[PDB]
Amino acid sequence: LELHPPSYPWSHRGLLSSLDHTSIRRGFQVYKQVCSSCHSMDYVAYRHLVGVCYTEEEAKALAEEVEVQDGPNDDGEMFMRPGKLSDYFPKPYPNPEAARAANNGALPPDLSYIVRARHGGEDYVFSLLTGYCEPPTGVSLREGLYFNPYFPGQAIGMAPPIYTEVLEYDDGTPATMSQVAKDVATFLRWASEPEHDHRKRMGLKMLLMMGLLLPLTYAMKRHKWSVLKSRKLAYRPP
Amino acid sequence: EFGNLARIRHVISYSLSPFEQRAFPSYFSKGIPNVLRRTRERILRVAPPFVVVYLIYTWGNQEFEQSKRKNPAMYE
Amino acid sequence: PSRLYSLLFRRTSTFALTIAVGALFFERAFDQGADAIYEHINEGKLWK
């Protein structure tokens, strides 16, 4: 028994509608400033951004923004290097336990494939992040819990992370809770499928090529098969 | 193989060259009537099982929902 | 046109030759065309 998030008219939903790629930019900013404290986008590395919403040199900037220490050192057991383009996004709470420790024993699931891993993810995400409504009568959530009608059980350890004007969009687009939930749902979506745009272009070329090739192959088949389909049989007993 | 497949007699068989015949002669001219002719001869054998599958599927869904519905008398 | 058949299709090799050349050029056009169509389709939502 769970609330089933409604269908939102997500822009990228269109058959050939690519991800905004402008919105995503905003969404990430949302992940970097809010969601990165607990969740880990393990499978998305700074380099990944280049080509989607940040240019090579631009990405280099962000990469350097954070610091990454690698153990291998000549004598030391580590060396700290500002993140390089190749470095993957920095996961907090190195061990999950760390996370559990501080998150009431609730592991913030990596939001790398969250949209793909959650049924109706894009919607779910939006709903969950925006579904932090009032608990009803009779409900008795355990210590360190909150009420969201969508989350399985309606008892998500995660406290509501998006308060209107939680962060300021560099683009200046008003940072309303929603504008922020929609941006982070687009971004998480992108994260779970960086190729969304490239694919849809392949699908458009595939539809054009099949629309060219199916009637022509049908015409070749009907040529070769016309011979028989016109064959007239006659029985002429002597 | 061919030549030893079967024995027929006095069955003449005329035919035409592909390039000498139109590609889709009377295609939609008779195709539609025929497709419709065909659908009639098979619709009563095919369709009513899938119709009652649709009724059973809907029924199951609705029944399940009602099942999930809270007894008014529950906890009162 | 008979010319086409007489010159391009009559010789099987030419039949292939024309196909070959056509293929060499089809990609260019189709790619660019579809690309732009796609670009227009998603005119505003892209990296740019």
Partner: peptide
């Protein structure tokens, strides 16, 4: 015998001749 009948009329199927041979 053979002459009893003529090739059935394929006109319905026949399209609308070397002049047209290449064309076809």
């Amino acid at each position: 015998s053979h002459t009893d009948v003529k090739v059935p009329d394929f006109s319905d199927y026949r399209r609308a001749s070397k002049e047209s041979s290449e064309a076809r």
